Structures are given as structure tokens and as C-alpha cells.
Amino acid sequence: NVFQTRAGCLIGAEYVNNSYECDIPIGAGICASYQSIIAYTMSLGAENSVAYSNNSIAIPTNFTISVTTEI
């Protein structure tokens, strides 16, 4: 239950090979979350590959009216 990070030494949490969104920022790309208490490397986002080619295009066929809030 002892982990060594660039920030320092962590006691009480176990490292997990999985990745999730950062909840409690620890540092050097390491975050902590509760589910026992686990520590992991935060995930940047969902990976996506676009189908680019020399002569192909994509055109929308529908729309959505969205409302957002800004404080």
C-alpha cells in the first residue's frame, strides 16, 4: 500500500493499472479516487480516429438546438 511518485511518497492507497478521469489531483499526472482509495494516472480523453481520404467528405443531415449556461 506504499507508492512512490514524482511528487513524493504515498501511503494508504494502492496503484491501479486502469485509467479514469482525474478526481483528486495529486501531481505529475497522478490522481486519487475513492471507490478503498486508489491512485492512478489520469486519462486524457476518449480516443477517436477519423476516416480521412483523398476524395471523401462527410455532410450533416440533422441539427440540434442546444442551450448552455455561463456564469
Partner: protein, 228 residues
């Protein structure tokens, strides 16, 4: 129109629900009050510090000692409390500067996104901006941005220009697409295929300079009229 109105009503209902349900949405306004209250409380707490003297009570120092060293003790107390007040004033000045910058940004947003339509990306909401509405809030303003978002995309095969009778045709306002057999010209942000004619296309040079040009015919509207 009817579908747009229904979507707008559903969106505003969802906004009301989200505001009613999420407690952390209004953290920005809460933080100003929280910072000010804690700063003022810390200023109050500073009053009960000895600042290196024997006692933290002024009149106690007056009564329990003669003027000679009581003067030194009071000098120390006054210097400490004046320094604390100066620190608080500096903190208030910095916070006021930051708040003024935020207020200028809010004024610009009100003048641009509300009183008109802005073409700046992401300045007035995520997506293509349509309009916005202002609302008041304790020491703040809340903007509701109504915006347009494309969806349900479809793949197509495209060509830059059309070679016809040794002439190169380019779209005037749209783009050339094809489902696999026939070719159409459609607007950029919405699928609306149309028969390619000489009114929505313009001619420039021959078809031996552009790369990727394809072969197809271009219908002429005046040809049937002259035929009869």
C-alpha cells in the same frame, strides 16, 4: 419550425432542471463571498494576537505598567495591527482588480453575444452561435446561449470541379457530392442535394489544370425553353 420550437422548449426545461439539481454550478459566484468572508474573519482574528508583547489587551498594558515600557508595548501593538490592515488592503486591491477584469469581460460578452450575433468561435457558447439571453444573479450575471449543433452526418464522394465541353465548372456557394452514380451540389452545413445547373456554378478556364476533376454533364435551364 415546429421541430426547432420543440427542441428549444426541451432544452430550456433541461437547463432549468440542471440548475435546480447541480450544486456546484454556481461555484464562481460563491467563491467571491467565501473569500471575502474568510479574509474579513482573518482580519478580525488578527486583533487578538500579542504581536510579541506580554499581553494582547491594550488597557491591561496601560493599567499594569508605568509609561516607560508601556509605550514600547503599545508601539509594538500598533505597528503589528497597522501592518495587518495594510496587508488586508493590498489583498482587497488585488481582488478588486481581478473582479474589474471579469466585469469588463462580462460587459463585452453582453454587448456582443446578446445585442447581436457574433462569429467568434467559442466566445458565446460551444457550436454555431444563434442568440443569448441574460439573467441576474447575486453579484453576477448568467448567460443562456442558444446555439446550433450539426448531427447525423453521412459520407459522400466529392470532386473539386466538373469538366464539361472543355470548360471547368466550380460551385458558387455549395460543394459537389455524389451518392455513387449521380452528382449534385449541396450547401456546406446541411444536406440538400440539387441538380447541377449553370446558375449555381461558374466557369473558369479549361479542365486540364485542376487535379481530381471528374466528367459529368451540366443541365441548362434555358435549353428546354429555347427548344419549344
Amino acid at each position: 419550425q415546429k421541430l426547432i420550437a420543440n427542441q428549444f422548449n426541451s432544452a430550456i426545461g433541461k437547463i432549468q432542471d440542471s440548475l435546480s439539481s447541480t450544486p456546484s454550478a454556481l461555484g464562481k459566484l460563491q467563491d467571491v463571498v467565501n473569500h471575502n468572508a474568510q479574509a474579513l474573519n482573518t482580519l478580525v482574528k488578527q486583533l487578538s494576537s500579542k504581536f510579541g508583547a506580554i499581553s494582547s489587551v491594550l488597557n491591561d498594558i496601560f493599567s499594569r505598567l508605568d509609561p516607560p515600557e508601556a509605550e514600547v508595548q503599545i508601539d509594538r501593538l500598533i505597528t503589528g495591527r497597522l501592518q495587518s490592515l495594510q496587508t488586508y488592503v493590498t489583498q482587497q486591491l488585488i481582488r478588486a482588480a481581478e473582479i474589474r477584469a471579469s466585469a469588463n469581460l462580462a460587459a463585452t460578452k453582453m454587448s456582443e453575444c446578446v445585442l447581436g450575433q457574433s462569429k467568434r468561435v467559442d466566445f458565446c457558447g460551444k457550436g454555431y452561435h444563434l442568440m443569448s439571453f441574460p439573467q441576474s444573479a447575486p453579484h453576477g450575471v448568467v448567460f443562456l446561449h442558444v446555439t446550433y449543433v450539426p448531427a447525423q452526418e453521412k459520407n459522400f464522394t466529392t470532386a473539386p470541379a466538373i469538366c464539361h465541353d472543355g470548360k471547368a465548372h466550380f460551385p458558387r456557394e455549395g460543394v459537389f457530392v455524389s451518392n455513387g452514380t449521380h452528382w449534385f451540389v449541396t450547401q456546406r452545413n446541411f444536406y440538400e442535394p440539387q441538380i447541377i445547373t449553370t446558375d449555381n456554378t461558374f466557369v473558369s478556364g479549361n479542365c486540364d489544370v485542376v487535379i481530381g476533376i471528374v466528367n459529368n454533364t451540366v443541365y441548362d435551364p434555358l435549353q428546354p425553353e429555347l427548344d419549344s
